[PDB]
C-alpha cells in the first residue's frame, strides 16, 4: 500500500 | 530489508525538482517527494485538493495521464512499477 506507506508520519 | 528502488530517470529529474539528492530512495521517499513535487508546481486544485492535473507536465507523461485523483491511485501504481528498478 503505496498510501500506507506515504503516511506513516 | 529496505526496498531500495533507482528511479527511472525521467522520474528521478521529477524527485530532484522536488528536493531530492542522489539517485536511490525507497519507495517512501520517492511518493513523498512525489507530493512534494505536485505541491511545489501547484499541479493540484486548490478547490479540489485530490485531482491533479499533469497533463503537459513530465509527471502526466510518466502516468499517461492529464489529471488523476489521489483517490483513485492506480495510473500512480502502474508507472512506479514502471519506472522504479529492483
Ligand atoms: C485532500 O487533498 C489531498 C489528500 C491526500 C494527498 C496525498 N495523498 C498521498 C498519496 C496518494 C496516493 C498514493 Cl498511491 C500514495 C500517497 C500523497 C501523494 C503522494 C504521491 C502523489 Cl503522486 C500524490 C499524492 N499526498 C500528498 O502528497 N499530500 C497530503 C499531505 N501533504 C501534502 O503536501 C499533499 C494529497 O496530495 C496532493 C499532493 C495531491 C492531497
Same mark, same amino acid.
Given at each position: 500500500d503505496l498510501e500506507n506507506l506515504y503516511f506513516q508520519g | 530489508q529496505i526496498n531500495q528502488v533507482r528511479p527511472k530517470l525521467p522520474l528521478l529529474k521529477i524527485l530532484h525538482a522536488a528536493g531530492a539528492q542522489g539517485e536511490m530512495f525507497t519507495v517512501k521517499e520517492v511518493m513523498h517527494y512525489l507530493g512534494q513535487y505536485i505541491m511545489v508546481k501547484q499541479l !493540484?486544485?486548490?478547490?479540489?485538493?485530490?485531482?491533479? !492535473?499533469?497533463?503537459?507536465?513530465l509527471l502526466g507523461e510518466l502516468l499517461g495521464r492529464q489529471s488523476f485523483s489521489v483517490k483513485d491511485p492506480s495510473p500512480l501504481y502502474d508507472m512506479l512499477r514502471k519506472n522504479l528498478v529492483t
Open positions: - | !493540484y486544485d486548490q478547490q479540489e485538493q485530490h485531482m491533479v !492535473y499533469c497533463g503537459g507536465d
